[PDB]
Amino acid sequence: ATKAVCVLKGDGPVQGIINFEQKESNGPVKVWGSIKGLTEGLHGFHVHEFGDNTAGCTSAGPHFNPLSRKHGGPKDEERHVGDLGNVTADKDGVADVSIEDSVISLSGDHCIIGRTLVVHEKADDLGKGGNEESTKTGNAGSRLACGVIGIAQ
């Protein structure tokens, strides 16, 4: 199988460990982990294009969009490859992530290993906000934490 781990770190109390798993070259990737230091509610969850940490989470660039599409939901027809939707944090700010996506990959041209996974400040409207920013970032807000996706054991 193929595994991957991401160490989410930020300037504030936002930090978490996100794990990935793909048992086949075309199989769905299982995203699970726990993030702390988040406001109670929904938070953006997207994989950005570049695995750059030279200027914090800003150097990661926009969302992973190899097909040159518009931002949307994970189960929507129009979406970026790195669009994973929202992650919900409880009252204690703990976000026990559990996402099963069939669009992202751990090997190939649309692979996410070597890029940046980012948890955002606000919620993702999944490209339904009605503005231009909904079809680019989903109005998810600023980047609280980020980390370079890497190969794990």
Added chain:
Amino acid sequence: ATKAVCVLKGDGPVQGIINFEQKESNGPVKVWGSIKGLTEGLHGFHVHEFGDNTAGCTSAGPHFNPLSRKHGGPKDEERHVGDLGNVTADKDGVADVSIEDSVISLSGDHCIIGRTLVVHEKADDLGKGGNEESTKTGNAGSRLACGVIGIAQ
């Protein structure tokens, strides 16, 4: 992939920025950058296997060796893929990086993207130290700083 990036950080004072450029899929990778906070002398510079920073640079794993060989220099036949050799820091502790390695690669079977780049405490004997650790890590010492090699623009 033709460009990569790796931000070096640790629990101590060592920190730096390393860039990778591989214009040809079968050409050498230009590794250049600058690291600071080191001791004046030679320090280990190897690419480890796992891009795992959950437990620090310890979870990074051993040196990247997909051919199952022994530790050596960068211009040696018997060497791990990540065995880039040593780096020299000046009297102020700044080590200007400039390595051209054809064994590593930004794509393919020898892909270092998604793995980690680890700097070390002491010098690397290139497998000629005289002990058992010489053929594994080269007596490079503790991992001072590490980071996941990410895709760059």
